[PDB]
Amino acid sequence: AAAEWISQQRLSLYRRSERQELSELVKNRMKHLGLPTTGYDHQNTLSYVLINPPPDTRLEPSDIVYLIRSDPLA
Amino acid sequence: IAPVLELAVEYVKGYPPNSPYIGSSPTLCHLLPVKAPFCCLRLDKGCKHNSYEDAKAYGFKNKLIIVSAETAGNGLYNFIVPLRAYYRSRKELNPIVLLLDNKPDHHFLEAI
Ligand SMILES: [K+]
Ligand SMILES: [Zn+2]
């Protein structure tokens, strides 16, 4: 009855995506080198730079403001 | 001739563990029960497990397939998989000897 399990793995291995392919390749290398697989566990964001925006621009969350801080030793 | 009707060591069978590249279609192949150490994949030198130094000392039952390639890469992997596929007859398996100009990397050896 091993053929039933072979067919189950065959359909699963055919249905797997490219992201699973890349993930298993990394994890295979990690086990071969000896590192734990967990912790390897994508970027749906868009970022840009606003140079000197007008003082009316709203501050959004996760905003990073470029600063020129004065010399601490001076 | 009957008419066509209108209406109708031993090897394990599994997938090669380490796929050498992305996009390699998984083929169910005749697999060794335990991974062969990289020393046992070399036909020239003898190792702990065998003292054989050429194909005469091995004494293969079947005739050999010798591949004279320059470097062992993912292409040579695509040569071995069709010959080791599960639907190929196991008794008719032909030993494959890779006659490489350059020493194979451990990535190729781990795949084969
Ligand atoms: K040998
Ligand atoms: Zn050996």
Swiss-Prot record, chain B:
It is linked to Developmental and epileptic encephalopathy 14: A rare epileptic encephalopathy of infancy that combines pharmacoresistant seizures with developmental delay. This severe neurologic disorder is characterized by onset in the first 6 months of life of refractory focal seizures and arrest of psychomotor development. Ictal EEG shows discharges that arise randomly from various areas of both hemispheres and migrate from one brain region to another. Epilepsy, nocturnal frontal lobe, 5: An autosomal dominant focal epilepsy syndrome characterized by childhood onset of clusters of motor seizures during sleep. Some patients may develop behavioral or psychiatric manifestations and/or intellectual disability. The phenotype is more severe than observed in other genetic forms of nocturnal frontal lobe epilepsy. The chain holds residues 691 to 831 of 1230 of the full protein. It is found in: Cell membrane. Homotetramer; which constitutes the Na(+)-activated K(+) channel. Interacts with KCNT2; these heterodimer channels differ from the homomers in their unitary conductance, kinetic behavior, subcellular localization, and response to activation of protein kinase C. Interacts (via C-terminus) with FMR1; this interaction alters gating properties of KCNT1. Interacts with CRBN via its cytoplasmic C-terminus. Na(+) 2 binds at R42, K45, Y52, F60. Belongs to the potassium channel family. Calcium-activated (TC 1.A.1.3) subfamily. KCa4.1/KCNT1 sub-subfamily. This is Potassium channel subfamily T member 1. It comes from Homo sapiens. K(+) 2 binds at G59, S68, L99, D101. Sodium-activated K(+) channel. Acts as an important mediator of neuronal membrane excitability. Contributes to the delayed outward currents. Regulates neuronal bursting in sensory neurons. Contributes to synaptic development and plasticity. K(+) 3 binds at R42, K45, N50, Y52, Y58. Changing D101N: Dramatically reduced the Na(+) sensitivity of KCNT1. Highest expression in liver, brain and spinal cord. Lowest expression in skeletal muscle. Zn(2+) binds at C39, C40, C47, H49. It comes from the Eukaryota. Phosphorylated by protein kinase C. Phosphorylation of the C-terminal domain increases channel activity. The cytoplasmic gating ring domain of the closed KCNT1 channel harbors multiple K(+) and Zn(2+) sites, which stabilize the channel in the closed conformation. Under low-Na(+) conditions, the abundant cytoplasmic K(+) ions stabilize the gating ring domain in a closed conformation. KCNT1 contains at least two Na(+)-sensitive sites in the RCKs domain where Na(+) binding induces expansion and rotation of the gating ring that opens the inner gate.
